[model samples]
Structure formats: structure tokens, C-alpha cells
Target: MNGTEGPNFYVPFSNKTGVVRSPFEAPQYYLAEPWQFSMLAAYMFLLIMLGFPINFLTLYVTVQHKKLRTPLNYILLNLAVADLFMVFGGFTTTLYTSLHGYFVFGPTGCNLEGFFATLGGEIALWSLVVLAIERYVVVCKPRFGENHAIMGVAFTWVMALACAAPPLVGWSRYIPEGMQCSCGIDYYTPHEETNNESFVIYMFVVHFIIPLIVIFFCYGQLVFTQKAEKEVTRMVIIMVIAFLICWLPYAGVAFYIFTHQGSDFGPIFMTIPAFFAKTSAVYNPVIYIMMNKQFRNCMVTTLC
Candidate 1:
């Protein structure tokens, strides 16, 4: 699904009296009026505007500081790239939507933007998976750390690519839907949703659930298997904790849709979760910078 079929097409819930897949049928109004648009516009500009510099700062400093090139930090680099995309989307999401509403990126921009958004979302999620597995190996077998760290770090990108590959082969395109533009599986049907459940499963399982399970296990092992001897385990725990805080509402909400499959969130549920999920892009960097020392230091060293 590309072009108009993409997730960008907007039809108000109230207006969709006869239209199928209208929000009126499901729950409540989704399209923000001009005032709501203005508020979101300011916010979108602010959030997306701030992203490039933060991400770039991390990227440049990491590349420059050879000392920072540990396998773990390499995962951070991958994450920075992914978060950059998430940020990129945020920067463009409102601007693009407000200006054009649908993908006006033309052909290439559409493909690239949609692909990267999908790709980046995978990268953000799977990088954690790799980090978790690496920590698992490190905690379980410290001797192997010297041996396996680099390979594991390399594999994270590979896996992130694997996660991103399906969509680029032309699985779907991002069409507009009301105030927020989402490229992934649309909960809205016929007009906005995906037919195959695999996309949902892919998003829920590969991008969110499986990676989460792995990380939680690794963290659990860190708690049970290893003593608090190392800071890395502690860091991963914090990372997972942050992940929970940022993502649980989304998961809780998403799991509802997933299990319900074709069920709607009734406007309140939909709007709130959607708002919170979009807000999530804002949280990842904040969590990393605030909680992780290296992340915090990167800000000082690069931006300051």
C-alpha cells in the first residue's frame, strides 16, 4: 500500500457518517481541528526540531572518540541512528502532515521516508534485543566477552536490517490518518489498515514483545545470576526499566488491539494511547541521556 492508500488519508470520525472505517463508527473524533492542529504543530515542531542536534551530537562525538567504540557503544551508535529516525519522523510527522496531510515526499521521499521509519522503528527495538543478548553472554561467560562482544554488536545491525527488510520489498506505505501519521500497521481497516495479521504480529512480536522478553530475561539473570559487581548489568536494568516506563502504556493498549484483532479503541482509548505512543519518541533519548552516563557525557562533550 503506497500513495493515497498509505496511512495519511484523513477523514474525520464525525464526517464519516456513511464512510466505512470512520472513527464515528468506532469511538470518537480523531482529526484535530485547527486549534488542536496548532497546538500539535507547535509541539511537533519543538520535539522534532530538537532531535537532529541531539542525535548528531551523539553521532559525531561517538565517531570522533575512538575510546567510545566498544561493542556496547556500537549498539548505542545503532540506537542513535534509529532514534534519529524516530526523531526524524517526529520532526517531519507534524510538518509533513500539516503541510500535505498525505505523503507529499514524492516518489523517492515517500519510499525513503517510509522505509527508514519502518527500518528505524525496528532498529530502535532490536538494538535493545542485541544489547540484552550481549549482556546475557557477558554476564554468563565473562571470558567470552573478549571474544563475542564485537560479533554480537555487529549482529545487532544485521538483525535490525532483517527486521526492516520485509517492508522495503514493498509491503506497505504510510498513508495519513488524522492528526498523527503512522507507517506501520493501521488499526483502521479497509481504508487505513493492513489485511494480514503478520504486520501486527511483526510489530508486536519482533519489534516489541520478543526483544522485551529477551531483555527482561537478561536483566533478570543480571539480578539472579550476577552480583552487582559490574555497572553494565545495572545499566541494562535501568534501560529495561526505562523501556517499561516508556512502552507499557503502548503495550497495554496495543495488546488490547492485538488480542482483540479488528477491535477498535473507542476514541478515548485510541486518542490517549496514540498520543502517548507518539510521545514515546520523546522519551527514549531522555531516558538514555538522563540515566546513562555515557549518553549524558556525550551531550556535554559534543553539544557543550
Candidate 2:
């Protein structure tokens, strides 16, 4: 169930006709008009511009400061690395597709592009889970913090790689779709024998829902039992809220499609959520720097 076949791109939902392709295939609209090209190019450009630098700044600031090199900060460092992976691995390919209005990366390129995107997403989300769990352990059992955080961070990356490996190994496939501007995991014909519902559902559950549960429990415990300072409470609240705010809409759409199965939700339904979800690459640095005084000073010092 290639994207071009299942949720066929209609060129802005105006055209009643569009091209379809074989399974695991990508559509190349080399004949795309200027307006279509402009729209996609503008989006890819802005996403790249903001996401790349913000992620890099996060990595740079953290690496430069010996004072910030704690286990929690290490988890955040990996989060930054994951976002950087998204920017370079997924978004760059999409930007090329947007400007060219075609998939020039070829089949292997498409597979790698989608693989990297999924990898980035899986790694980032699971890193958040590790961060939450580490905090919970620290707040509840301060004596056990030394080795656990490092082990947890390593485990998160391993978990992400294991989850992302299935698609490449034939459980499912990656293909480019949605105005033919991006590549990602296949989400079409989600319930049939030849479809991919099981894989998609597993991804959504592990990547989004499970993380949310862990975060909620950990943060809730912090607020309820620790008698945390006002600032700590607020930051914890904001962190939880930010995670939800960034991911919920995308997860909602995924859950909708996952539950709906073969329903015809179309490309337009993905537009807003996709936009916001990718913007999350930039959100971490902003949230961390603004909410914490130490990070803010570190960022300023790194910049200077």
C-alpha cells in the first residue's frame, strides 16, 4: 500500500485525478507547477532553517559546559542529537523533493531517508521517556541515580533502533507521499493482509503513548510527593505540557488513522500535525533555555 496508491496525492486536493504506484514506490511529480513547488519549498526551507540551528545550539551549549554534564543533561544531549538527525536525515531530503517537486533520492535513498526519519523520531521520543524515568528515580530514590541514568540513556537508543529496524527488515516499508514532498513509514491499507496496521500501531504505542504514560506518572509523583519548589514544579509542568503540545496532534492523527484503518483521511489531515511535529526539533532548546536559568546562561556563554 504505497502512499500514492492508498492516500493518493491530489495536488492540493483540487484535482480529482493523480498518479498511483506499486508498493514501496515513490511518485515523482517532475511536472509540478510553480505554486506547488513554492509552497513546499517555503515550508522545507523554514523548517530546516529553524530546526537545524536550534538543535545544533542545544548540542553546542551542553557540550561546552562542564557544569552541565550530568546524566539528565546527557539525555537532553541525545535528544538534541536525535533532532539533528531529523533535520539532516529526513528534512533535508524533503527540502530537495520540495524544490525539485520530485524524488531524486532513488529507491535506496528513499528507504534510508524514511529510515532515518523514523529513527530520529523513535530516538527523540524514547529519550524523553528516559529523562522522565530518570527524574522519577532521582526524586524518589536519590541514592540509586549514579549508574541508572547512563544505562537508561543507552537503553533508550537501543530500544529505538530495535523498533525502527522492523520496517527495513520487511515488517513494513518506507515510501514518500503527501504532496510527494516527504518520506516516512507506510500508513496505508492499514488492516488488510497486504497492509501495515500492526506495525504502525506498535510504533504509535511505543513512541507516543507509552512515553506519555511514563512522563505523567513521574512528573505527577514529583509534584505530589516531593514538595518541589515553585520553579521546579512549573518547569516540570511546562516540560510535560510541551511534550504533549508538540506530539499530541500528530499522535491523535496517527491514532485516528490507526483506529480508522482504511478510512480516507487524505493528505490535508496530515498538514497541520506534520508541520507542528517537525517544529518540535526546535522546541526543546527553547523550552530548556527559557525554563532553566543555568541553560540560559550556558547558551549565552556558548554563543559569546
Candidate 3:
């Protein structure tokens, strides 16, 4: 432990006296230079500033205007809510830890942040999946009904919670992740923990692979239904593209980490992907106002 002791050194509270310790061994594995930590702080600060208010405005405008509360808009509203959760749950803790140069939030903080971030992120992803399928159905097949839309929103939360709750009950675990400034699933833990391996594989398939396949399939069929409403399809396409741009790199890095196991890609490499993933919270509302005219007009009117 000689090499591991320093200003940055840490041992998770849960590991201190437990019969089983957390798999995160080397604190140095997740440490970065001081300036690098500062950069992360700045990035997280910007994300919080941009993500919070815009997502709030999106929700506010939607709720205030009855005309905007269509079945499709319900899914958009759900996305905004999830984005706000991301801002509050993930970005705030990240900003704090990045500024301090390590996770200051202890085991319980790690658990809360990890659970909410995963819950919010999974909800956002599944909401998009539902949005794509809903759009395809309305355009290609043709009310899906308001009841279905409500069901869709509820389904997104239920599924997200299902994926996020397992770690708290010990399916895997939530511990400090990349740069040691944020918390997430213990994907780096080796197979000595059978639950971690299964949980990573489960999330990879359910959270990442299944959503991608469903969204792509829905959009593919929507494109083939050339008779569909052109503007709505275009907007959804842009939304899907932006979502993919924000999250795909994070998923790619996670996959790399999962496959390699014990390999060290350095803190910067790991941290950058998480940064990109958090930026999705900012992107969703910008897309909403930029592409959807009613949302834009409502925001303009509401503010002025």
C-alpha cells in the first residue's frame, strides 16, 4: 500500500470493515492531475447550468399549454423530466467531486448518485425507444391513444428502476468510477464477483443493445413509410441522432472497459466518455426548442 498512499488515496467506507471489500483497489487507477480535475469541474458546471433550466423550461411550457400535451409530446415531456433527474442526480455530485479531485460523497452518496443517474439515464434511453416506436406507429400504422402514451411513460420509469435497483440489492454494486469523481456500476470488477459480470452483461444487453435495436428498427420502418408526416419524422430523426452522439461514445468506452477488465486506460480516457454522456441532458431540450415550433414559441412567450 506504500505506492497507494497520498493526498488522493481513498478506501471506500463499505470496504473498511466488511468481510468483503469493494473491488476498487488502487485509488491511483482513477486519479488524474490537478488541472485535469479542474477541467472536469468546469465541464460539469457547464452541463448543470445548461441542462437544468432548459429541461425545466421544457417541462414548464408543456404543462402550461394544454394544446402541447399530445400523446407524442408526453414522451418528449418524459425525456425532459429524465434530463432534469440527470442534472440533479449526476451532474451536481460530479461537479462536487471534480472540484475536490476525488469522490467526497462516501458509500451512501455513491449509492444515491449511482442509482439516480442510472435511473435517469435508463429512463431517457427507454423514452427515446418508446418515442421512436410511437412515432412509427402513428405515422406508419396509425390514437395509440392517450392511455397508451401514459402507459408508455410509466413503463419507461418501471424499466429504468428495474435496471438501477439491482445494484443496491447486491446484483453488482455501485462504486466510484472514472477519475474517481463520479459513481457508477462496478464494471471494472473482475469475475471473482459473479454478480458483477452478470450485471454488466445484463445492462449491456438490456440498457444498450436492446434499445438501439428497437429504436433503429422503428426508425427504419418509419423511413420506409415515405407517406409519413415529413416534419415530425425529421425532428425525431434529429433527436435520435443527437441522443446517439451524446451516449454512443460512453457506451463504447464502457464496452471496452468491460471486455478488457483490469486494463488501465488512464483517468482522462475514462472521464471523457462520462462527460459526453452527461451532456445528453443538455442536448435534449435544445433539440426540443430548436426543432419543435410550439415548444419554441411557448418558451419565447413564457420568458418574454
Model 1, span 1-304: residue lDDT tens:
1111223332323333333342212211244445554554566677676767666766777787777755566766666676677667444744554443333443334445445555655565666777777777776764435346567656666776665555545443343333433333443444323344566566667667777778778778867873522655566666666656655775576566546544432333543444445544555555556656765776687666
Return the clash pairs for model 1, or none.
Answer: 6-175, 7-174, 7-175, 7-176, 8-175, 8-176, 9-176
List candidate 2 segments past 4 Å from native: 1-34, 142-146, 190-195, 226-233
Query: How much is 281 displaced in model 2, in angstroms?
Result: 1.7
The C-alpha stretches of model 1 lying farther than 4 A from their native spots are 1-31, 99-115, 142-150, 168-180, 190-195, 226-229, 258-271, 278-285, 292-304
lDDT of 3 at 193: 45
Q: Give the higher-TM-score candidate: 2 or 3.
A: 3
lDDT ranking, high to low: 3, 2, 1
Give the TM-score (vs. native) of candidate 2: 0.82
lDDT of 2 by residue, 228-272 (tens): 334444565676677678777866775675566445555557655
Q: Each prediction's Cα lDDT score?
A: 0.54, 0.66, 0.73
Question: Which has the better TM-score: candidate 1, or candidate 3?
Answer: 3
- Could you tell me the C-alpha RMSD of candidate 3 in Å? 5.2
Better of 1 and 3 by lDDT: 3
